[PDB]
Amino acid sequence: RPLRLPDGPPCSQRSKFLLMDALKLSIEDPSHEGEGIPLYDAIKCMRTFFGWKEPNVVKPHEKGINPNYLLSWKQVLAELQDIENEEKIPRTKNMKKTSQLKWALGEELRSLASWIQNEFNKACELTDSSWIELDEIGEDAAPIEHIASMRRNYFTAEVSHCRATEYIMKGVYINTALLNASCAAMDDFQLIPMISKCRTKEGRRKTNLYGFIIKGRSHLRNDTDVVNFVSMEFSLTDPRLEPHKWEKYCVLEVGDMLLRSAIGHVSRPMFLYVRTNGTSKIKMKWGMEMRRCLLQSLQQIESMIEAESSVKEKDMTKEFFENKSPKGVEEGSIGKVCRTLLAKSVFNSLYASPQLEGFSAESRKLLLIVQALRDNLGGLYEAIEECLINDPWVLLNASWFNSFLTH
Numbered sequence: 001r002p003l004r005l006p007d008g009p010p011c012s013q014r015s016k017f018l019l020m021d022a023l024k025l026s027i028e029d030p031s032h033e034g035e036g037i038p039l040y041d042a043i044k045c046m047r048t049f050f051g052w053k054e055p056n057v058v059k060p061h062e063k064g065i066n067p068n069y070l071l072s073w074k075q076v077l078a079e080l081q082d083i084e085n086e087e088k089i090p091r092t093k094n095m096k097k098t099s100q101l102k103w104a105l106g107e108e109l110r111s112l113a114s115w116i117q118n119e120f121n122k123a124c125e126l127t128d129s130s131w132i133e134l135d136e137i138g139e140d141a142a143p144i145e146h147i148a149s150m151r152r153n154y155f156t157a158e159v160s161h162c163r164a165t166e167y168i169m170k171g172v173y174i175n176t177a178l179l180n181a182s183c184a185a186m187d188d189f190q191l192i193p194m195i196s197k198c199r200t201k202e203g204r205r206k207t208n209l210y211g212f213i214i215k216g217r218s219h220l221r222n223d224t225d226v227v228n229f230v231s232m233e234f235s236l237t238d239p240r241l242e243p244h245k246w247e248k249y250c251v252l253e254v255g256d257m258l259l260r261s262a263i264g265h266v267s268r269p270m271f272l273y274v275r276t277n278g279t280s281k282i283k284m285k286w287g288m289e290m291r292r293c294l295l296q297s298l299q300q301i302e303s304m305i306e307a308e309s310s311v312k313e314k315d316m317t318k319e320f321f322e323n324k325s326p327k328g329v330e331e332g333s334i335g336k337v338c339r340t341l342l343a344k345s346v347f348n349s350l351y352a353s354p355q356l357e358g359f360s361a362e363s364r365k366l367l368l369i370v371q372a373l374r375d376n377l378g379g380l381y382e383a384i385e386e387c388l389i390n391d392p393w394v395l396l397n398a399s400w401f402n403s404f405l406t407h
């Protein structure tokens, strides 16, 4: 019996920041006065783009006050325009407590949609930039063994350029900046750039601006206290193609960007995805630990190599990673196995939820029972299917589980 997935309107994006739809304004090998101060980097990234235009709503938020989102973006541009006149650019920028920001900061079954599988496919892909250093992975006090080192070097070469690794580092930066601001500027509506850093194929260091968040008041006495925030994120994705994906956003058109393409230079609109959101201390601490996704999925790989080494009474690291008993790789390559394991780990983090917890545990129990039944030939379903409500990541993993059943 396959799991019964819920009927209803398509599910919508619920991640803390854009994934496949993000857009970056970037600067190469930066060397301005104050390189490495987020606000300074953001302004320089902002100053590389000249296609800004009078913004307007193109996909209104059905349940929100759309003029306040518009006003909120215009305030960001205006207050950055002010900073450009203050001869000493401040280290941080606290927004005026305008009515639009006071509103935005707080003073149902859903069916599976195709976009979540597309997000996952996108997370498995390679990018043309590296997002981590060679020795990023691991925490060991002592120097590591030769074998462990070999395994780490092989794995890193496969995932350093991976999109899921960008999501890790993007998530790590934004959660660190937000948690630090929640502490250092409790009463301020601080402007917090969304930044990442990477190294191009040619070795050039590069700094990336995805957009901005503004945080609300944050007197976070405990781990579950919530700080509100507004996110404002660049994108080339036209929201009118998949509006169900964007139920929680107000989307603006804010510029036009000139692009290289397969058909030569082309001009495409630049959008700004705006929503209100919230997070807590404990979620921000987990966001800061997303590099553990790299360690956890390496350990799944090492688990596999250690099994092959136990059978062949010999270390199989080179044989495993160079693909040289197994006669192929189901995902196509060892590299794609690494990136797929990583993407599952990262999405478990980006889409963490009680629904995911229940589905994970309960579907595992049903798995083993189905395996043992195969190899040798209700109730648990209620536990599994009770978790299938509206979360895109859970619904996709259920769709995946159902394929595992037909085969």
Ligand SMILES: Clc1ccc(-c2cn[nH]c2)s1
Binding pocket: 043, 046, 047, 052, 053, 077, 078, 080, 081, 084
């Ligand atoms: Cl930094 C900034 C770069 C561009 C800005 C702008 C755009 N429209 N009005 C002001 S502020």
